[PDB]
Amino acid sequence: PRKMYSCAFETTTKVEDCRVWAYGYMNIEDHSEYKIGNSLDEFMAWVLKVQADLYFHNLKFAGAFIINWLERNGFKWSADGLPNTYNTIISRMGQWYMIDICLGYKGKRKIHTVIYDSLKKLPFPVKKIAKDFKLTVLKGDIDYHKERPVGYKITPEEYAYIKNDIQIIAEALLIQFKQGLDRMTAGSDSLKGFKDIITTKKFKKVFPTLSLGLDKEVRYAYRGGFTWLNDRFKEKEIGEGMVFDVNSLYPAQMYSRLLPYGEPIVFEGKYVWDEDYPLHIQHIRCEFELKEGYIPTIQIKRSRFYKGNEYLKSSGGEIADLWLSNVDLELMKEHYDLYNVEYISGLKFKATTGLFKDFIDKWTYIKTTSEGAIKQLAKLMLNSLYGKFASNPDVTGKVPYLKENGALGFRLGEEETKDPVYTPMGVFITAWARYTTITAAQACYDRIIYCDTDSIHLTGTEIPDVIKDIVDPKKLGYWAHESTFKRAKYLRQKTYIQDIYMKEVDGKLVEGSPDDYTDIKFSVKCAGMTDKIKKEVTFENFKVGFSRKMKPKPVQVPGGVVLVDDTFTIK
């Protein structure tokens, strides 16, 4: 059986002297088996013999120093795994998934040691994982800026830290491996747990593979969450308001919305109602104009000039070519006026509402009757299933090379195709989720400020009558009143600040209200901004242009990678 280890490195900050100054590995199935050294060569020697699976939390970082060594020691990339060859899996976007170091073959069996990224299985920081999973974690951290000459001697303190960091990840991964959750990513673990429940046989019949051409057309109807900032509040400091968040958005749509499955049926012109093929995607061409008092919902695919992440008020003179789910089209007709419409073609699908009920009940039950690690993993199982259905078949990522400086460099590999799971399911799940948010926001049009996938922000502190009946703190798919603020300022999508009313309960601060609060918690949300940077933001300086050179970024130098403080600007 191949073994499994939790690994970690401790690198130097010098842009010139970049090298591993400490390492450590621990057997996931036997934590008594562990070693902490201070030589990459010593480590790599081990890596070559173990013939096992290794896991680093944030392979992107450690996976660098590993490539540098493999290259300066008889290895080079090779998709078909050859002796002293090493293949990889990296995406055009720069996400590391696996490094498969091959040494040779014995019979027809492949002698190798694969290196995986634990961050892909547990999408959180070690600190956070420890906290939420309730695993012993030492406070403080190894002095990062301290001269460490080659062959440096690791102190007992650093040793303890290094052991703790890898023991946490080991304890976490073991809980998943103990349940068959032995996949590379969270999504895949979720898909696996899903197949276990309905059986692979049924899965195959229900979710047929589609022809790349058909899948390309369905993909045209896919969209993400609904993130929109009302212009009426753009860059203005406002008063009291409140925030509502849906209780498990996606899992909720999966639990009770009419979703597609099976083989699609192509049709010409405008879809005709068919009880056995309830859902459909329509290829339509038209012009549109936003109806008075309605939120925009139509977004034209990025780069097909009109604009990227913005919702159109009108086609502005030019014809729109769209592929919409029946949910999206229904919503569009309620909010817009359509003109010069031409129904081209489309696809029909059979649909049911009972496809994920058992999967959700199971894991939710577990989530309800568990705590610590078990609880968090059940949440992960439930929260990672929807994404898997929507996967860009074009798995064409970067291919490793050695830059003339002795630094790691990459270049585009070529088109590789990973046949689809079932895209139609991704289209409708996201569509239903958008419908949930948009209709709720539209119902509160006079008070609506901002929307972001599963939450709506409104002015005022009283729960709107139109949504009173679907507001609850825990029920699935219902809206929960998350917080109330005394003042806020929204600059753009996913970019805002608030002063949240907080009250003390059982010795800890929790969201309060105007009639019951003891403190005001300043909160900053901005894509890209780091913890440290947020501490310098205030109501009188939070605006477009804000800048600080406090956002470190991976700058690959000879040996591995180093973090150099770059500039961060609110644009």
Swiss-Prot record:
Catalysed transformations (reactions): DNA(n) + a 2'-deoxyribonucleoside 5'-triphosphate = DNA(n+1) + diphosphate
Substitution effect: E10A: Strong loss of 3'-5' exonucleolysis
Outcome reported for the amino acid change (mutating R434I): Complete loss of TP-dAMP formation. Almost complete loss of DNA polymerization
UniProt: 5-methyl-UTP binding residues: Y250, K367, K379, D454
Site (Stabilization of the incoming nucleotide): K362, K375
Impact noted for substituting D165A: Strong loss of 3'-5' exonucleolysis
Effect recorded for D245E: Complete loss of DNA polymerase activity. Slight decrease in template-primer binding. No effect on 3' to 5' exonucleolysis
Cofactor(s) this protein requires: Mg(2+)
Result after altering K139 to I/R: Strong loss of 3'-5' exonuclease, proofreading and strand-displacement activities
Residues flagged as site, Probably involved in binding template-primer structures: S248, N383, G387, T430, R434, K494, Y496
Region (Involved in DNA-binding, coordination between DNA synthesis and degradation and TP interaction): 188-225
Effect of N383Y: 3-fold higher Km value for dATP and more than 11-fold lower Vmax value than the wild-type enzyme in the initiation reaction. Impaired in enzyme-DNA translocation
Short motif YCDTD, span: 450-454
Site entry: Stabilizes the primer-terminus at the polymerization active site and contributes to the coordination between the exonuclease and polymerazation activities: K525
Annotated site residues (Interacts with the phosphate groups of the incoming nucleotide) in this chain: K367
Annotated site residue numbers, Involved in the stabilization of the frayed 3' terminus at the exonuclease active site: Y144
Effect of N58 to D/H: 88% loss of ssDNA-binding. Decreased in fidelity of DNA replication
Site residues, Probably involved in nucleotide binding selection: Y250, K379, Y386
Positions of the UniProt region annotated as Involved in DNA-binding and TP interaction: 559-571
Consequence the record notes for mutating S248R: Complete loss of DNA polymerase activity. Drastic loss of template-primer binding. No effect on 3' to 5' exonucleolysis and interaction with the TP primer
Effect recorded for S188N: Loss of DNA-binding. No effect on TP binding. 50% loss of replication/amplification
Domain notes: The N-terminus contains the 3'-5' exonuclease activity and strand displacement ability. The conserved motif YxGG/A located between the 3'-5' exonuclease and polymerization domains is important for DNA-binding, coordination between DNA synthesis and degradation and for the formation of a stable complex between TP and the DNA polymerase. The C-terminus is involved in the protein-primed initiation, DNA polymerization and pyrophosphorolytic activities. The YCDTD motif is essential for the pyrophosphorolytic activity.
Quaternary structure and partners: Interacts with the primer terminal protein; this interaction allows the initiation of TP-primed DNA replication at both viral DNA ends. Interacts with DNA.
Protein name: DNA polymerase
Gene (UniProt): 2
